[PDB]
Amino acid sequence: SRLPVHQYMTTAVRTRIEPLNAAFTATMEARTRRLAD
Amino acid sequence: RDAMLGSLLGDVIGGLTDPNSPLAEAEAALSHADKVRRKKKESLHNEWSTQVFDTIQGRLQAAVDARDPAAIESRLKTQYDQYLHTTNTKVAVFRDVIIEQDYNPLAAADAAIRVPTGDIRDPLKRDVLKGEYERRLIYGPLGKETLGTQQWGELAVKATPYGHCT
Amino acid sequence: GLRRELAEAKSIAGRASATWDKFRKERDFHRMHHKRVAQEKNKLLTDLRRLKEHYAKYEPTILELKKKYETLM
Amino acid sequence: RKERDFHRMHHKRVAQEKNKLLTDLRRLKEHYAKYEPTILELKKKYETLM
Amino acid sequence: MREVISIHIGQAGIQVGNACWELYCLEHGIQPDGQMPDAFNTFFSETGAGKHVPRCIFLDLEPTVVDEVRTGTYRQLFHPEQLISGKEDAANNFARGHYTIGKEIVDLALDRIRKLADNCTGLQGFLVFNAVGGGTGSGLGSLLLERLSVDYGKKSKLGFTVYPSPQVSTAVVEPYNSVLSTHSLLEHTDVAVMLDNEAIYDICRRSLDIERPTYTNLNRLIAQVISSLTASLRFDGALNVDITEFQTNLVPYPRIHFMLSSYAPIISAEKAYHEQLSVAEITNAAFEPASMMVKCDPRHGKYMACCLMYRGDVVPKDVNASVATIKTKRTIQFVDWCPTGFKCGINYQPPTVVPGGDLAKVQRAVCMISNSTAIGEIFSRLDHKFDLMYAKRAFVHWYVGEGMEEGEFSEAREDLAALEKDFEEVGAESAE
Amino acid sequence: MREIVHIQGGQCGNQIGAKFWEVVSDEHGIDPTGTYHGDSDLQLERINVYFNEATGGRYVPRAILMDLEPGTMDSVRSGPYGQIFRPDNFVFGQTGAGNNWAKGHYTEGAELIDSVLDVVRKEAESCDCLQGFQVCHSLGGGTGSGMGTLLISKIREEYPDRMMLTFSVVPSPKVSDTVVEPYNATLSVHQLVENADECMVLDNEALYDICFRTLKLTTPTFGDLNHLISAVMSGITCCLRFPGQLNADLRKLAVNLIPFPRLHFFMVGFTPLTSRGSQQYRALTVPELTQQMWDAKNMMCAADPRHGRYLTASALFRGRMSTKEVDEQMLNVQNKNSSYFVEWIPNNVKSSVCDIPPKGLKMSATFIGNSTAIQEMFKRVSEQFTAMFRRKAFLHWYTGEGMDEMEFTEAESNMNDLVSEYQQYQDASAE
Ligand SMILES: Nc1nc2c(ncn2[C@@H]2O[C@H](COP(=O)(O)OP(=O)(O)OP(=O)(O)O)[C@@H](O)[C@H]2O)c(=O)[nH]1
Ligand SMILES: Nc1nc2c(ncn2[C@@H]2O[C@H](COP(=O)(O)OP(=O)(O)O)[C@@H](O)[C@H]2O)c(=O)[nH]1
Ligand SMILES: [Mg+2]
């Protein structure tokens, strides 16, 4: 139950771009919702 | 003058708000075209995703799910131990020569995950690939004949007939 | 070898028969929309003429308000 | 196939010139929309002077 | 203007730091005193406008290696405010460098960084030089790297690390310090470049026929690799490769940022005359495994992306011929999803030679940094190396006592195993 | 009363544009300092096409140098014919795209488009009757492609009744200098089909082939590659700069060569390219130029004209010659190759003659070709795109600046309707 590599943004890349910071957190809530469903 | 001014101001003001105005008709046509192209854009993105990307990543992540990490570290340990044994025994290891009995580094490339990608039909390539679809029911070797790019270097540039004695 | 040639001919006839059914449907799909857009194209042509007539009213209106505002001044 | 490609070619060509008149409609729309604040401001100015 | 701040952490970083800043001075004509050679010239000297202080930080908790720089041949080059010492070394403990001893020094380090960031007009990146084998390079390295991501965004963090050898060790607790530091290297670096200690030993034994290589000789041709990739910023060329060009072409995915290194012409002075150093000749030598700076097989993995920094008299014609000869050979294998995988960067400046150096004067040079799936081959060696020691839980009371919890060992193991699965996942090929 | 605005984009555009202003300024008689020294009155008559008036008899080019790095503008400024350019046209960025398409298009190109559009609008309003917008750049870059294509979008919005010429250097399959190179080209061509009125397509592997097969240069650098591209650009504008027997300006070439608005991509090639060893042996005649012109190895495009059909072709002959020999030669090549030219367009090749040859050549010819055969180059870029985009390789760098992966679908789709239309008109026949 791991995130695919093209969706996992590391913190160094994440701290560069706040649009991409929100892109990763949109994927994080997608993981919690899919596992709960 | 006053009646003409009143009529002109009346039409140029009522055209901004009248639903039967040509301005309103043009706005309706533009909004319809914008909605149509936005819907077509979203439909193209979704159909490409579902027909190609979801299928390919489903196959790939299913293969990785079937794959076990412990076997991966064991296999890479054996490969690295083989490489260090070859570098310990031989007087340097060179890429061009391969002794199959001694050391087979291509087995690592052979033991790799394989994804079929033959059932997938790309929705973006519908108009390009319709011709080869109807002929049958990546493209072929394409380009023009040119000089071999191995011959572009300073060594073969004199061996090739162009610039033989120049 | 005669049985193989008959199987190939039935395969050729069978494969073709499925396809030209699709060709007939697709060519009917193109004819209906091409006529539909052509009728829609002529509507935009008349709309463009009307809007140019409507836009032609704008620049006299700017001039006429400038004339009236100076006379009122 | 030849009959299909004849109508395929014609359908695409009318579709292309549909968008060309569409962009020409948009260009004339943006041009005279800039005249709109001027003609509104003069009309409000004309009413206040009355 | 292009400008780069390079931080050197640990003993291994500062010994490279002594070597690389020696080479930078000879490249730009800077003397060890720092002065590049009517009445304005007399005014020019006494105002210090001819002095070029490096944009570097020498921080290490062990004082006995940083005062050698303070009393060495480069005592006038470095600002004394830029050289940071400590009372006690981290001493091969990731817990000491990250929690207890490295805590009261890293706050002083960002104070030095903020002063260096104020002098620079527009910053472009950060360069980290450390070894994950030791305590300070790993522990204080991870702490400084974690804080620099918080304080500075959109600025790249380029990582130069000296990973432990599979066979050669100077200590015992390398698997603990490497694995814990790796979890920071996954998370906070932008591009990480591997360096292996004995892979350079095999280079100096074979290519430069020196039977007695020491750390001074290894760090000298290490300093060749660092300057070659950043040579696009110093000097103009036919094809420039900036520090932001490096990231956008060489890492396909955010986790995949560990990279290999290679330097193609490594020829002694006597051997230089008989050898013909052509662009096509050294490019074949660049991809040769024994010329690589990391002990690994390029044939084991597949090159996902690669770059080539060319220095000297290289025309764009024959380098492109060298591109095609590599691709057509069956021993070098690419991944299927990257057809155009080579970034070509040519600098017009020939590589400098240090006085007394073992490298000879070579007209044309290639530095090859490539991303391969055979770098998880290196990780799998350290994976079971750490797993065998952690099974009996030896050398844990040093880490537990100095602030670190037990669960940090499992989390770094969890992150490292994820990268092990990562390289097999992306190393997959799509074949019809 | 005709003039062309020239725009240079990125490192490739600045390097090619420097060598283009090397030729035309030397052809018109401009010295390094910017003053007139020509001995013929015909050179001075039409200089407003490419040069503006200045005090003291100086002539500054109508060039706008734009990029995102200061590195490659120090080269053009220090190079020869580098002082004629206006420093007010030296607009530049500092961060640099680094061969990223959307970094120069969305997050950093937006802060520079307002500066470059003010310079273009100031230069366009100064002159009287615009003929077109000529831009030289590359499609595989990020500096000249991402910023350049957005300027192509912007100036087409506020100048919709003007021609537009793009001399774009495409990526090559055989030789590659960038890893994310197919991403930059696919998004650039998508922005070029609607905005740009017509496109001149150049490829480095074709330029490298012609520099060694014909000119026999054993060591081709970028200098002699850009020289051949420079000679083509001066060949297109032969009508405006000088009189001739038959005059065909930028508008007339566009209306002859473009049957349908999407089919506006071209393949070009300069005709009289001989090595100096074989210079004295060859005799320059009108039949000799026509044999070389239709040859595939003389083409500056990586596509193969042998494999495709010529929808329209145009040859711009420069020099003193007989028009009867021109009409006989073009009719000679159409009849002897009937399956090579398109069937539903009679009089397939339309040509013009100018009586002023270029410097150093008594006769010259510039060939413009609208062949259907150009789909293969776009297919080769499309092959590498679907290799990368189906695995999301190197895509997190592109989606950072707000342009998500959703905006890649229509770029490839508009990369595919172009090659389908070219394929459709090839197979289509009369009646
Ligand atoms: N290439 C290179 N590697 C070195 C050099 N010096 C040390 N190393 C590496 O660093 C390891 C020793 O640990 P260090 O990182 O130096 O430890 P440290 O920097 O002193 O930090 P502490 O142990 O906390 O004091 C060795 O295993 C070497 O692999 C050097 O001069 N050159
Ligand atoms: N003809 C020509 N092509 C060039 C030149 N410089 C670069 N290129 C091409 O441009 C491509 C790389 O584009 P790049 O320089 O990164 O564009 P940029 O992003 O605007 O700087 C390479 O594939 C080269 O083939 C030049 O001087 N002449
Ligand atoms: Mg120490």
Q: What one-character-per-residue DSSP string does F97-121 give?
A: --S-TTIIIIISSHHHHHHHHHHHH
Its sign, for the CA torsion E274, E277, E280, E286, is positive
The 3-state DSSP class for residue C50 equals helix
Side-chain-side CA neighbours of E231 within 13 Å: the count stands at 29
C-alpha F64/C-alpha F122 separation (Å) is 11
What are the backbone dihedrals phi and psi of residue E60, each rounded to the nearest 5 degrees, phi first? -165, 135
Q: Are B53 and F406 in contact (CB under 8 A)?
A: no
Residues 6+ apart with CB under 8 A from B89: none
CA of B26: which chain C residue's CA is closest? Answer: C47
Closest residue to E253, CB basis, from A6, A11, A12:
A6
Closest residue on chain D to C65 (Cα): D42
B61 min Cα distance to partner chain F (Å): 12
Interface with B, mutate which of F377, F420, F422, F426 (most B CBs under 10 A): F420
- Give catalytic residue positions of E: 245
Please name the amino acid found at residue E8: H
- Establish whether residue E178 lines the binding site of ligand 1, counting it when its CB lies within 6 angstroms of any ligand atom: no
- Count the Cβ atoms, other than its own, within 10 Å of residue C37: 17
Tokens of F306: 């042998």
Q: How many angstroms separate the CA atoms of B65 and B59, rounded?
A: 10
Q: What is the structure's resolution, reported in angstroms to one decimal?
A: 3.7
Q: Is F271 in the pocket of ligand 2 (CB under 6 A)?
A: no
Which parts of E3-126 fold into alpha helices (H)?
10-28, 39-46, 63-70, 94-95, 103-119
Q: Does C47 touch chain B (CB under 8 A)?
A: yes
Check pocket membership of F353 for ligand 2, CB cut-off 6 A. Answer: no
| CA distance to partner chain E, nearest, from residue A5 (Å) | 7
CA distances from F44 to E329, F69, F318 (A): 57, 36, 18
Residues contributing to the annotated binding site of F for Mg(2+)? 69
Closest CA in chain D for residue C55: D32
Residues 6+ apart with CB under 8 A from E176: E94, E386, E389, E390, E395, E399, E409
CA–centroid distance for E154 within its chain: 20
Q: Is-contact E105 E97, C-beta < 8 A?
A: no
Measured between CA atoms, the residue of chain F closest to residue D2 is F428
B65, B67, B129, B149: best to mutate for the E interface, most E CBs within 10 A: B149
Beta bridge partners of F198: F165
What distances in angstroms separate CA B76 from CA B90, E296, E430, one per listed residue?
Answer: 21, 11, 22
Nearest CA in chain E to A16: E154
Cβ(F8) to ligand 2 under 6 A?
no
With contact defined as beta carbons under 8 Å apart, do E292 and E260 qualify?
A: yes
Atom of ligand 1 nearest to the CA of E62: 25
Report yes or no: F4 and F49 within 8 Å, Cβ to Cβ.
Answer: yes
SS3 category, E330: coil
Are F401 and F103 in contact by the 8 Å Cβ rule? The answer is yes
Helix (H) or strand (E) holding E343, with range, is strand E342-347
Cα Rg of chain C (Å, integer): 32
Whole-number Cα distances in Å, E133 to E174, E353, F416? 5, 30, 53
| E297 φ/ψ sector (left φ>0, alpha ψ -120 to 50, else beta) | beta
F37 touches chain D (CB under 8 A): no
The SS3 of residue F92 is strand
Count of alpha carbons within 13 angstroms of residue E301, beta-carbon side: 29
* Contact predicate F72/F15, CB 8 Å: yes
Ligand 1 atom having least distance to the Cα of E215: 31
Please, are residues E303 and E332 in contact by the beta-carbon 8 Å criterion? yes
Q: What is the C-alpha radius of gyration for chain D, rounded to an integer number of angstroms?
A: 22
Is the CB–ligand 1 distance for residue E226 below 6 Å? no
The encoded tokens of residue B33 equal 């075209």
- With helix as H, strand as E and coil as C, how does F31-58 read? CCCCCECCCCHHHHHCCCCCEEECHHHC
Length of chain D: 50
Q: Whose CA is nearest to atom 17 of ligand 2?
A: F141
Query: From the CB of E15, is ligand 1 less than 6 Å away?
Result: yes
Closest CB to E340: pick one of F72, F100, F384: F384
Token pair for residue E152? Answer: 């500075």
Residue whose token pair is 């701290």: A15
Listed in order, strand segments (DSSP E) in E141-214 are: 156-163, 191-196
Contact F173, F302 (CB under 8 A): yes
Report the alpha-carbon distance of residue C56 to residue F246 in Å, rounded.
40
Q: Which residues of E touch F (CB under 8 A)?
A: 1, 122, 236, 238-240, 242, 244-245, 247-254, 304-305, 315-317, 320, 323-324, 336-344, 430
Substitution target in D1, D2, D4, D20 with the highest count of C β-carbons within 10 Å is D4
Q: How far is the CA of E137 from the centre of ligand 1 (A)?
A: 8
| Strand positions, DSSP E, E359-424 | 365-372
Distance between Cα F158 and ligand 2 center (Å)? 29
CB contact under 8 A, E300 and B114: no
List helix spans (H) across F267-389: 286-293, 323-336, 375-389
Nearest CA of chain F to the CA of A21: how many Å?
9
Name chain F contacts of A9, Cβ cutoff 8 Å: 396
The Cα F233–Cα F238 span in angstroms is: 9
Nearest-ligand number for the alpha carbon of E221: 1
Residue F262: both structure tokens together: 């999407």
Contacts of E425 in chain B (CB under 8 A): 60, 64, 113
Q: What angle do CA E106, E251, A20 make, to 5 degrees?
A: 70
Query: Rounded to whole angstroms, what are the CA distances from E376 to A10, B75, B76, E380, F326?
Result: 18, 12, 8, 6, 67
Q: At what angle do helices D35-49 and C58-72 cross, to 10 degrees?
A: 30
Q: Is the CB of E196 under 6 A from ligand 1?
A: no
Q: Helices (DSSP H) in A1-37: which residue ranges? A: 11-16, 18-36
Task: Answer whether B touches E (≥3 Cβ pairs < 8 Å).
Answer: yes
- Please count the other Cβ atoms lying within 10 Å of the Cβ belonging to residue C36: 12
Atom of ligand 2 nearest to the CA of F144: 20
> Closest Cα partner for E245 from E156, E335, E327?
E156
* F205-209, long-range: CB < 8 A, 24+ apart: F205/B146, F205/F172, F205/F173, F205/F174, F205/F175, F205/F302, F206/B144, F206/B146, F206/F299, F206/F300, F206/F301, F206/F302, F207/F300, F208/B152, F208/E317, F208/E320, F208/F175, F209/B146, F209/B147, F209/F297
Give residue E320's identity as a one-letter amino acid code.
N
Q: Is the CB of E138 under 6 A from ligand 1?
A: no
- By CB atoms closer than 10 A (0-12, 13-18, 19+), residue F162 is middle
Cα E237 from Cα E310, distance rounded (Å)? 9
What determination technique applies here? cryo-EM
Q: Hey, what are D1's tokens? A: 């196939």
Ligand 1 atom with the smallest distance to the CA of E222 is 1
Run of H or E residues at F182: helix F181-195
Give Cα F28 distance to the centre of its chain: 21
CB contact under 8 A, D8 and F424: yes
Chain D hits for B16, CB-CB cut-off 8 Å, are 36
User: Please, what sign has the CA dihedral across residues B144, F234, F73, F168?
Assistant: negative
Give dist(CA E30, CA E34) in Å, integer: 6
Kindly list the distances between the CA atom of residue A21 and the CA atoms of E68, E72, E135, E360, in Å, as whole numbers in the listed order. Answer: 44, 46, 32, 48
Taking 3-state DSSP, the helix, strand and coil percentages for chain C, each rounded to the nearest 5, stand at 95, 0, 5
Cβ contact, residue pair D22, B16, below 8 Å = no
For residues E14 and E140, is the Cβ–Cβ distance under 8 A? no
Location of structure tokens 């079929």 = B116
Please state the atom number of ligand 2 nearest to the C-alpha of residue F67.
20
| Element spanning B36, H or E | helix B22-48
The token pair that represents F124 in the structure block: 């366009």
